[PDB]
Design a protein around this ligand. Structure first.
Ligand SMILES: NC(=O)c1ccsc1NC(=O)CSc1nc2ccccc2c(=O)[nH]1
Ligand code: NA
Ligand code: NA
Ligand code: NA
Length: 288
């Protein structure tokens, strides 16, 4: 029914030695982490990989963060990294969590009509742990022909989130850390304060991942949604800070057989900026 979302390190390592495969490092870190993803790629990466810069695949005209680009922009960029319609794209990142920003890129390719895409389970962390082969040097690829076309069903807008406060057609699940959702930990963006969307439920993205940074099983993921009173038989929308880690909610749903979980791309940054005071639920004190 669905093209597989996960591939293993061992399957990738074997495939390297043997529908072309394109490995993409989509690492991206918030400034306060003090890490530079592209610099790290140049030092060490999976052999043959290219670096997918999520800042080259976003709408910089927006005041909000990590917003989808238009289809032409995406297509041009994917093609420049050597992706074609026949390609099996496998995305990874080098996060401490295992996967962090890579699931956004999996979701983006699918939203743009490219369904033969997967994530490297455990990311570069696991790859390194296993002492698998690595390469260095700046990113490069020959170009390929790529077309894209956005399926709007992959997205919810601010207007949709606001209407749903009353209509209650879909469940909203927020992948931010618990303290950000509750209002007790800061938002990384200056001018944005923490808290959550009324009626939403928190499943921090780390809840989908084991202690080794691998994805939990579909069985454990279904249990996790059920315990949080999230019903995979009803409509579900994923949100987070800027629409990136929300994709872990989409992924865990997809692995559970529910492949139609849109992302609220605007996410908390947009919600906060466009809010009236009643729209911010927080243990913290509302802005004066
Ligand atoms: N360039 C940026 O988006 C940026 C720079 C400083 S703060 C920031 N972005 C944000 O604070 C958006 S909220 C946010 N974005 C993320 C992006 C990638 C991965 C995780 C997150 C997150 O938890 N929250
Ligand atoms: Na976004
Ligand atoms: Na580079
Ligand atoms: Na802030």
């Amino acid at each position: 029914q669905l093209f597989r979302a996960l591939v293993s390190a061992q399957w990738v390592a074997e495939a390297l030695k043997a529908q072309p495969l394109k490995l993409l490092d989509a690492s991206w870190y918030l400034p306060k982490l003090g890490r530079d993803a592209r610099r790290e790629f140049e030092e060490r990466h999976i052999p043959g990989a290219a670096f997918f810069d999520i800042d080259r695949s976003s709408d910089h005209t927006s005041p909000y963060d990590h917003m989808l680009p238009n289809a032409t922009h995406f297509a041009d960029y994917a093609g420049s990294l050597g992706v074609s319609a026949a390609t099996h794209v496998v995305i990874y990142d080098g996060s401490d969590q295992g996967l962090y920003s890579a699931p956004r890129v999996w979701w983006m390719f699918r939203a743009f009509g490219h369904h033969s895409v997967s994530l490297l389970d455990g990311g570069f962390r696991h790859w390194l742990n296993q002492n698998l082969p690595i390469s260095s040097g700046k990113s490069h690829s020959e170009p390929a022909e790529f077309s894209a076309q956005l399926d709007p069903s992959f997205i919810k807008t601010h207007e949709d989130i606001l209407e749903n406060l009353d209509a209650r057609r879909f469940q909203v699940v927020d992948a931010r850390a618990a303290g950000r959702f509750q209002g007790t930990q800061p938002e990384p963006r200056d001018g944005i304060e923490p808290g959550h969307i009324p009626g939403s439920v928190n499943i921090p993205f780390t809840e989908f991942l084991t202690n080794e940074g691998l994805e939990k099983s579909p069985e454990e993921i279904k249990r996790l949604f059920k315990e949080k009173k999230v019903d995979l038989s009803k409509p579900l929308v994923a949100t987070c800070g800027s629409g990136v880690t929300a994709s872990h909610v989409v992924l865990g749903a997809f692995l559970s057989g529910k492949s139609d979980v849109p992302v609220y791309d605007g996410s908390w940054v947009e919600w906060y900026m466009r809010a009236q005071p009643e729209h911010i639920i927080s243990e913290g004190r509302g802005k004066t």
